[PDB]
Amino acid sequence: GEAPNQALLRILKETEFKKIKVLGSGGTVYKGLWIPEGEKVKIPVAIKESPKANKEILDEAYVMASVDNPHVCRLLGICLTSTVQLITQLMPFGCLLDYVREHKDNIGSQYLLNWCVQIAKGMNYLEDRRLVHRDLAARNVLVKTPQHVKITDFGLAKLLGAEYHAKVPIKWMALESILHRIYTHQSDVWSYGVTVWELMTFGSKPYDGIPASEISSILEKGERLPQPPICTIDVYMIMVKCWMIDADSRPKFRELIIEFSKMARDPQRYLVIQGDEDMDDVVDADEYLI
Numbered sequence: 001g002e003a004p005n006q007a008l009l010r011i012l013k014e015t016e017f018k019k020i021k022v023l024g025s026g027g028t029v030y031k032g033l034w035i036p037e038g039e040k041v042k043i044p045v046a047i048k049e050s051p052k053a054n055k056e057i058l059d060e061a062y063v064m065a066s067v068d069n070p071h072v073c074r075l076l077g078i079c080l081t082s083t084v085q086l087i088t089q090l091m092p093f094g095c096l097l098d099y100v101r102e103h104k105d106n107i108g109s110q111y112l113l114n115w116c117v118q119i120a121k122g123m124n125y126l127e128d129r130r131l132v133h134r135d136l137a138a139r140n141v142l143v144k145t146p147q148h149v150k151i152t153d154f155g156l157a158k159l160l161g162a163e164y165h166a167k168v169p170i171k172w173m174a175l176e177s178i179l180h181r182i183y184t185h186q187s188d189v190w191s192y193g194v195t196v197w198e199l200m201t202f203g204s205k206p207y208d209g210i211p212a213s214e215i216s217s218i219l220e221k222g223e224r225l226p227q228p229p230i231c232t233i234d235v236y237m238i239m240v241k242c243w244m245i246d247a248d249s250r251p252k253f254r255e256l257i258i259e260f261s262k263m264a265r266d267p268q269r270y271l272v273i274q275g276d277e278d279m280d281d282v283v284d285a286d287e288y289l290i
């Protein structure tokens with residue numbers, strides 16, 4: 001027996017939004033203000049604006065409405081206009097992949113290790129809610145402040161019952177997923193390892209210049225992503241443990257929290273980086289609880 005999902009799905013009027021600029025297209029992601037009726041608050045939001053693709057975006061809203069954790073992006077509501085719109089909290093600093101790329105020369109060890117802690121906390125929460133993400137990557141981690149990141153993009157996420165089978169991001173998937181289309185929380189751990197490598201290399205592309213069709217044979221021969229320059233063996237060994245063939249001998253998200261937490265207490269024993277060492281009624285969504 002599975003527990004009843006008593007999450008609320010907030011349907012928001014279209015007149016409650018004063019959508020401002022466009023953030024980025026691909027669909028489209030807007031930014032704007034959400035002003036609930038006569039609540040005297042202005043909440044900065046992001047809005048994601050024809051066919052059966054409506055089914056997918058609503059499957060996304062189902063997952064996002066059913067999560068509540070400081071390191072997971074939650075759905076504020078949907079607007080049922082001509083198009084189905086997803087309304088989420090504005091993450092004003094962008095995605096973490098763009099952030100580490102545009103700020104390499106100003107990111108210290110404490111920030112890198114804290115992000116690894118927070119991402120592991122969010123993933124451990126998803127595991128607690130029996131959620132396999134299947135698209136964990138630096139591009140899908142958003143930055144509320146440089147000290148606070150959250151996981152987003154649940155378009156591939158699936159709810160395990162009391163391994164899931166099935167276009168996918170090859171250079172982030174465990175071998176068993178590339179080969180057998182098998183996805184578990186431990187295959188998420190593999191993607192976590194690639195995501196940490198992304199941060200540790202300040203946004204390098206994993207297997208840059210290697211066709212995705214070759215990834216399965218490369219991983220089978222025993223090859224893995226190289227040790228990033230700033231990484232001590234301690235940190236790189238954690239990433240290598242995420243890439244083991246035996247999925248059960250990979251670290252659990254609850255262990256990665258612990259390990260990175262200890263390292264974040266002495267961040268330079270583990271990362272070697274040169275240089276280390278309107279408004280008025282605006283309320284962040286994390287402070288608007290209903």
Ligand SMILES: *CCC(=O)Nc1cc(Nc2nccc(-n3cc(CN(C)C)c(-c4ccccc4)n3)n2)c(OC)cc1N1CCOCC1
Pocket residue numbers: 023024029031045046048088089090091092093094095096097098139140141142152153154155
């Ligand atoms: C890495 C790409 C990116 O997201 N850039 C970005 C993000 C944000 N802030 C933001 N706030 C709330 C929600 C989002 N957001 C972005 C995305 C796109 N994916 C890749 C993360 C989604 C999304 C959610 C679910 C399903 C599909 C997509 N939600 N982003 C920015 O606001 C400041 C600005 C930017 N970029 C700035 C630099 O140029 C590119 C855009």
